[PDB]
């Protein structure tokens, strides 16, 4: 779609050229002609008295390439004065043929679903993190990785809320009036770009912390042992630093080129693949680790109902590794259109938004260790 800034520039050029022409053109010296003028929509040369005036359709319209043909009409009185239309500030005018030649409902639906999901996820995850940090008994490398994962999900939710607020600010009435007059607004600010850069970093950090959790679980089940402190430092580095290795280059290239969108629109997918490919690698590795862990659980269940327990263990292993993305990971943005795009967006928005909620519930609330800790802490508080 055409940008508002381009429309503003085209209108400004049209207005400047028309005003210069009308202020430089000599009088037509016609018979009782009305003096040439210019209104907010289009130009108006000298018009014959007591008759309508035909002028071609303006070329600065967003739909110029859609309906180039069109004539704008203006009425003039027989005394050389523009006709005063009924209760209108401007004289008589007609633009019916100059007009242009809904996804709001689905946007509203997806927005409500994913905002509610992220709010509930934020609440559940902050509660779970408080519970985990409050009890000193539960501290271990596994729970440290879990706390980092909870922090990543909370940051993702916060970035989503700030991004929604920034989008509201960008297309607010004040910003609209600022842009129409040619003045700087929220769109041209650096904070607008930084908001989306933070959102992308939060998303990438969340995916890489899911990968870190999966790798740690696989190393636990691969019967491999190393230095706990060095491994933990390496996992922290992978979780929080590796996303900066590509988000920063993406920010640099999107600053140097195609900055006019305030880093919001990814029209050319060649630069958006820079972010996408590491996330796809993450998804592939997590899917392979999920498959291997399910194979190990199969081996453990077979030798010591079996299918019911297999199904139960498979479902609980999805939120922790985020394997639900694999169902639509390779359905690229270049091809998802219409109903397929709707299904992809709905699934990925709804499941990911509630993914933090399920992770928090499964690994804090219904976890047997945490429940026993709660029970024993309550008993001790009643022993005081």
């Amino acid at each position: 779609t055409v940008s508002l800034w381009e429309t503003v520039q085209k209108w400004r050029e049209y207005r400047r050229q028309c005003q210069r022409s009308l202020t430089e053109d000599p009088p037509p010296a016609t018979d009782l002609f009305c003096n040439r003028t210019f209104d907010e929509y289009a130009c108006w040369p000298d018009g014959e008295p007591g008759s309508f005036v035909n002028v071609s359709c303006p070329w600065y319209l967003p739909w110029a390439s859609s309906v180039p043909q069109g004539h704008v009409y203006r009425f003039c009185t027989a005394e050389g004065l523009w006709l005063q239309k009924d209760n209108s500030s401007l004289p008589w005018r007609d633009l019916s043929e100059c007009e242009e030649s809904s996804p709001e409902e689905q946007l509203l639906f997806l927005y409500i679903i994913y905002t509610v999901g992220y709010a509930l996820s934020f609440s559940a995850l902050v509660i779970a993190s408080a519970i985990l940090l409050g009890f000193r008994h539960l501290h271990c490398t596994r729970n440290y990785i879990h706390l980092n994962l909870f922090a990543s999900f909370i940051l993702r939710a916060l970035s989503v809320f700030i991004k929604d607020a920034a989008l509201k600010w960008m297309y607010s009435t004040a910003a609209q009036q600022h842009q129409w007059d040619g003045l700087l607004s929220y769109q041209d600010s650096l904070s607008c770009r930084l908001v989306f850069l933070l959102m992308q970093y939060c998303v990438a950090a969340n995916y890489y912390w899911l990968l870190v959790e999966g790798v740690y679980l696989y190393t636990l089940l691969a019967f491999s042992v190393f230095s706990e402190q060095w491994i933990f430092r390496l996992y922290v580095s992978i979780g929080w630093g590796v996303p900066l290795l590509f988000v920063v280059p993406w920010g640099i290239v999107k600053y140097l080129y195609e900055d006019e969108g305030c880093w919001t629109r990814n029209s050319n997918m060649n630069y958006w693949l820079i972010i996408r490919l590491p996330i796809l690698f993450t998804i592939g590795v997590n899917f392979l680790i999920f498959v291997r862990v399910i194979c190990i659980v199969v081996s453990k269940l077979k030798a010591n109902d079996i299918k019911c327990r297999l199904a139960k263990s498979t479902l609980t292993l999805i939120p922790l590794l985020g394997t639900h993305e694999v169902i639509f990971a390779f359905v690229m943005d270049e091809h998802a259109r219409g109903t397929l795009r709707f299904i992809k967006l709905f699934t990925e928005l709804s499941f990911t938004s509630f993914q933090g909620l399920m992770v928090a519930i499964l690994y804090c609330f219904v976890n047997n260790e945490v429940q026993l800790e709660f029970r024993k802490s309550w008993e001790r508080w009643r022993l005081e």
Binding site: E40, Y41, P103, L107, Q176, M199, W272, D333, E348
Partner: peptide, 30 residues
């Protein structure tokens, strides 16, 4: 990831709506 694509889509749609509002405001003589 669908969050970025969704953000791009809503931004594009609101850009189109803003352009339509701009042209409508131009029609009414500002």
């Amino acid at each position: 990831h669908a969050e970025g694509t969704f953000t791009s889509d809503v931004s594009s749609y609101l850009e189109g709506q803003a352009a339509k509002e701009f042209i409508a405001w131009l029609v009414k003589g500002r």
